[model samples]
Target chain A: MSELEKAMVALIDVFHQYSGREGDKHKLKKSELKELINNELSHFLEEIKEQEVVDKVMETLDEDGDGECDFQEFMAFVSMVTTACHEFFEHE
Target chain B: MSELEKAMVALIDVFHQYSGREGDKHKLKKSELKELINNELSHFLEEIKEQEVVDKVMETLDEDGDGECDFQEFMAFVSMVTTACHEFFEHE
Candidate 1:
């Protein structure tokens, strides 16, 4: 696979690693999303240390108001972070 | 950096590789975007074989109707393809 294809797969794999840890194997509950950001995006994103912050992050991500993140939602978050990172470096 | 971080960086790198090939170094012209999909996403997405298809893709991705895709638009396209790929495999 190309690097881009592999990157896409990596995003899926990382999401599943946390989402499958608890309920709804295909979706990420609040805790699962928190763990994903903490572990997988530690360098790119700030760590979610407080419960309220986690809730807020979930609230922003859960566009469907399901209180959990599906693969689509996770990808949106990833895109947002990646875009921000790109902008940061482009201005540097 | 984590695997996910590396993956995010890969997306940015790939975008620049094609976007910088011609005009507007920060954005992907229609040809640049088509070349990117053909070369980087050949396995995940169909190759752009026709001018009409390439124009349609750029039209869809160019949210601002700027005739080119910025990093944000490129990331959105990546997120979309990745989500589609995830859904395709999850249903299997």
Candidate 2:
């Protein structure tokens, strides 16, 4: 697989590593989401330190208001953050 | 950086490698988009063999009707394709 393809797979794998811990194996609850950001995105995003921040992040991505993030929702969050990172590099 | 962070950087790097080829430095023209998919996503997406497929892809992703794909639009496409790939694995 190409690096891009591998990256896509990595994203899927990373999400499952956290999402599979509890509840629906295909979805991420707030705690799983918090751990994912803190552990996997430590370099790009600040460590998610507060319950309020986790709740807000969940609220923003929970498009269906199901109180959990499905794969689609997780991808949206990833895209948003990735785009922000791209923009940061663009301006630098 | 974690593996997920590296993947996010790869996405940004791949987009710029294509988008910087011609016209706007920050967007992908149709030809650039076609080459990007053919080269970087050959494993996940079929090669763009016809102009019609490229046109349709641009039309679908060019949300601003600009006839090109900006970083945001490109990330949306990545998110979509990645989500589809995730679903394929989920059902297997």
Candidate 3:
């Protein structure tokens, strides 16, 4: 397999770790996202943009605008951001 | 900028990139507070629920509790959930 394919497979495995389990049934909170992003994708960002991206995802997730995000908000964020991410990876 | 001020400057830069910057800031629709909390404070918070402290501060800034924080809320003395270590008094 090519490097890109390997990376995709790795990302898919990563996705399954988070999305396939709980997200398929429920949603993930900001803490969960932080762990996943920090552990998986921290290398992709410098320092600032990572948080900024996390924040962007948060606003997307946090529908109530209540300064806190619940499960439903988590679902919305992963759906949107992951779809955006899926397109990015697919293009490569 | 001193070291604290330098940290402040970096975080301020981080802030502009997220809060008011054209490309990224647009993602937020009054629901971006906790993102500031999480990424700015990846270490500070063991969990995202800690953002209620951030939310409390935002509310203090927001005054009427409208769920939206304005530039006025960015007063230098009080720091929200984000980065760059200042005098700790001035920023955090």
Candidate 4:
């Protein structure tokens, strides 16, 4: 992926950041979540392979900080994405 | 969501830069491709919301310019990503 795509990823992360859940976050149905992730954001990160971003996000937005990201967690995850993207832009 | 992760997407794409298969590239089973995109590339674009990104990539890589991208096209897709990413950073 090019820096354009990467920036695009940050933009997508921002979208999720704003859409993340409020309560009991980090409990996303893996399948449903993947659907939105793939269908909605497949373009930018089609080739991205990093695992740490997801892990860190799970740790942060998993309301309970649980191991998995439930619906609520998924929503919260979006918020972080949004914040991360914004902060990144500010830094750059 | 920060520029850091966005750049991460570019980096991951770079990783695939060298590893993209040589033949039958786009034919990755939908599930296999999703796994590679999600598990492998999930982090950077976790919240990305763009659809055009996927459309353009597929369209460009579909060697024969078929509607869908196959394995051979997939490798070609990598090349584009490589070019896009490099160009983006270089411009910045």
Candidate 5:
């Protein structure tokens, strides 16, 4: 597969790596979400050191009010961050 | 960077690899988008062989009604496609 296609697969793989570790095998609980942010997104976003910040991020992303982040919700956040980064680089 | 962070960077790099080839150094004209689909997304998406199909996709993604696709619109398309792929895999 091309690099871009591989990247998409990596996104799914990364999500499942965390999501599978806890309740609701197909979704990411708060801990999984926090880990994903702190570990994978630290370069672009802050380290997400506080529980309240994670809650706020989850609240904004939890469109269905499910409190847990499914893959779709996670992808939305990824897309938002990617777009923001792209926009930032475009200006630089 | 982590694997997920690298994936995000790959997405940006792959986009600019095509978007910089023609008009608007920061946006993708139709030809560039077509090339990107054919070369990068053929694994997940069908080859996108028709002019009308490309036009339809560009039209749907062009939230601002612009003739060209900026990075934000492109990332939205990527997110949608990735979500669909994830859903398909989850059911399988």
Candidate 6:
């Protein structure tokens, strides 16, 4: 696969690796989301230090109010972070 | 870096590789978007076989109506496509 294709796959694969750990199996429960962000996105995002922050992150990303983040919601979060990263580098 | 972090960088880098080829240094004109999708995402998306299709894609994605796709708009498009892919595999 091309690097971009691999990147797309990696995003999906990384999500699944966490989302499948418990609960819905296809959605990210709060703990799973917290772990994914802290472990996989530590470079881009500060280590999620507090429980309330995870709740807030899940609440913000969970558009359905199901209290869990579906892949679509996770994608939106990724898009936001990635856009910010791009803008940061663009200005530097 | 983690695989997910590398993936994010790859995405930003891939966008620049195409977006830098054209008029705007930070936005993708229609042709640049066309080439980026065709060459980089052919495995996931069908080739842009028509100019109107590219125009439609740009129109749909360009939330700012700037006649070009900024990094934010491009990231949104990528998020949509990646979310679709995640959904597809989730059902399997």
Q: Name the best candidate (by TM-score).
A: 2
- Ten-residue stretch with the least lDDT total in model 2 chain A: A71-80
For B3-86, candidate 2 gives per-residue lDDT tens digits of: 787677777678777777787576678777778778877777888788587688667666678988766567656766777777
Q: Which lDDT tens digits does candidate 4 get at residues A1-92? A: 23435534553344334323333322244343344454544553342245455556456545455556643234334334333443455463
Runs in model 1 lying further than 4 Å from the true structure: A22-24, A51-69, B20-25, B51-70
Instruction: Order the numbered candidates by DockQ, best leading.
Output: 1, 2, 6, 5, 4, 3
Instruction: Kindly report which residue pairs in candidate 5 clash with one another.
Output: none
CA lDDT, candidate 6, residue B16: 71
Better of 3 and 6 by lDDT: 6
Candidate 6 per-residue lDDT, tens place, A31-75, comes to 876777788778787878786777886666566688876665666
Clash pairs for candidate 2 = none
CAPRI quality of model 4: incorrect
The C-alpha stretches of model 4 lying farther than 4 A from their native spots are A1-92, B1-26, B44-53
**Residue B35 of model 4: what lDDT?**
43
The count of backbone overlaps in candidate 5 is: 0
Per-residue lDDT over A58-80 for candidate 1, one digit per residue giving the tens place of the 0 to 100 score: 67656678877666566656766
Please provide the root mean square deviation of candidate 6 (C-alpha atoms, Å). 3.8
Please report how far candidate 6 places residue B84 from its true position, in Å: 3.8
lDDT of 4: 0.42
How well does candidate 6 score on lDDT at residue A83?
68
Ranking the candidates on lDDT from highest down gives 5, 2, 6, 1, 4, 3
Misplaced by over 4 Å in model 5 are A17-35, A49-76, A83-92
By summed lDDT, the worst window of 10 consecutive residues in model 4 chain A runs over A18-27
- For the second chain, the TM-scores of the candidates in order are 0.82, 0.83, 0.49, 0.45, 0.85, 0.83
Chain A of candidate 4 gets a TM-score of 0.44
Better of 4 and 5 by lDDT: 5
